[PDB]
């Protein structure tokens, strides 16, 4: 006789978790921007209508998504990986210019909106970069966990910037080696000497909101599976 009220309260908890996930997803969506998000939805629609008919065979499995969804790093780096990449977080990694050109043909043929920027792997020149042998700067690319097939594109985005201890060190290092430098908390110094820094928050670090969304998804999946097995063996 105590079962229906516990069922109702467990559904209340599940609905609270879903509302939390909608909140965090909308936070990520607001930190993403309208043009980038509509562009992602548009690429999704083009490849959906593309795979409905199965045309252009290496093209449909040739789009591997955004840069942001192809790597994950430790949270302490979440600020400094963002600000040196910027909206390069939302470049679309693709194999060649074939898929970029075909996607854009369908794009301005069907007249669907959004900003999209393509990183074709086949046309990124692998200049073998030689990184400095100091105890003062870790290569940024070294602290990124990503599939090595995409290793060209990340070398285009992160392949020159270094993570130094603090700002004096980075201003010496960047001028010394013609490399970008950036501290752990977001302050930069360019290879031309341009200083850029201030206070970077943890509220709109898109990687942190992404990880909030992903952790909420894992939590929601665990609760859904547990309650669904409870209902599966409550039919008896």
């Amino acid at each position: 006789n105590y079962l229906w009220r516990e069922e109702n309260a467990e559904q209340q908890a599940l609905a609270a978790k879903r509302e939390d996930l909608e909140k965090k997803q909308q936070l990520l969506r607001a930190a993403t921007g309208k043009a980038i998000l509509n562009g992602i939805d548009s690429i999704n629609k083009v490849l959906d209508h593309f795979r409905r008919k199965g045309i252009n065979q290496h093209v449909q499995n040739g789009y591997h998504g955004i840069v942001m969804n192809n790597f994950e790093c430790e949270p302490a780096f979440y600020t400094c990986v963002e600000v040196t990449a910027g909206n390069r977080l939302f470049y679309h990694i693709v194999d060649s210019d074939e898929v970029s050109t075909k996607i854009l043909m369908e794009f301005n043929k069907m007249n669907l909106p959004g900003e999209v920027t393509f990183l074709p792997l086949n046309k990124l020149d692998v200049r073998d970069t030689a990184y400095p042998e100091t105890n003062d700067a870790i290569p940024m690319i070294s602290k990124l966990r990503y599939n090595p097939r995409f290793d060209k594109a990340f070398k285009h985005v992160f392949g020159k910037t270094l993570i130094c201890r603090s700002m004096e060190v980075s201003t010496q290092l960047a001028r010394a080696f013609t490399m970008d430098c950036i501290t752990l908390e977001g302050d930069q110094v360019s290879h031309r000497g341009a200083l850029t820094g201030g206070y970077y928050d943890t509220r709109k670090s898109r990687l942190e909101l992404q990880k909030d969304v992903r952790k909420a998804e894992e939590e929601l999946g665990e609760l859904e599976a547990k309650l669904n097995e409870n209902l599966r063996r409550n039919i008896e």
């Binding site: 700002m167 201003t171 001028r175 302050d187 031309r192 000497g193 200083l195 820094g197 201030g198």
Partner: protein
């Protein structure tokens, strides 16, 4: 109001390190005519809001003070630390254009290095066809801009984008409005 607190922290660092924080680049330079207002705003770009300071030490000092005040991060150009090449004098002896750095004037003559870095050897042309002609017709190609804001990079990447350039050009006369108000 983000611009209000931006100018607040700006005036604070102006009064803290006064012989070494020259100002932003907009409040420190303006073009020769009014026609070039578009083209200059396409070449300077983010450098329009770059704060021009004397050396790298004052750069880190201002950056850490902005971080202590939890403000909007800004961009600094240290004159002594900036990597520039001298302005190519041969390009003044050109058939159809002159350099964009010669199209703007400074305000303290020390700051020339910063306007060597934000401009370099960019060139500005009346119409699009003239810009294309001097950019691609010579045996050496040059970063050329048209009066309507279209940018002709050395690699050949044609850059068009006057959607937000109208407001970036309106800031140039809005600074004169701000001077007449103050």
């Amino acid at each position: 109001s983000r611009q209000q607190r931006k100018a607040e922290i700006m005036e604070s660092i102006k009064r803290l390190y006064p012989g070494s924080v020259y100002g932003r680049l907009i409040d420190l330079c303006q073009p020769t005519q009014k026609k070039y207002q578009i083209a200059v705003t396409k070449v300077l770009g983010k450098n329009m809001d770059a704060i021009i300071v004397d050396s790298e030490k004052t750069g880190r000092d201002c950056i850490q003070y902005i971080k202590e005040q939890r403000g909007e991060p800004e961009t600094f150009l240290p004159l002594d630390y900036l990597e520039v090449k001298p302005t190519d004098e041969k390009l003044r002896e050109l058939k159809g254009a002159k350099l964009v750095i010669d199209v703007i004037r400074y305000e303290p003559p020390h700051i020339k290095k910063a306007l060597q870095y934000a401009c370099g050897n960019a060139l500005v042309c009346d119409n699009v066809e003239d810009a294309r002609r001097i950019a691609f017709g010579g045996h050496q190609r040059h970063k050329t801009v048209a009066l309507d804001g279209t940018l002709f990079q050395k690699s050949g990447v044609i850059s068009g984008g006057a959607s937000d350039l109208k407001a970036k050009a309106r800031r140039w006369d809005e600074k004169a409005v701000d001077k007449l108000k103050e």
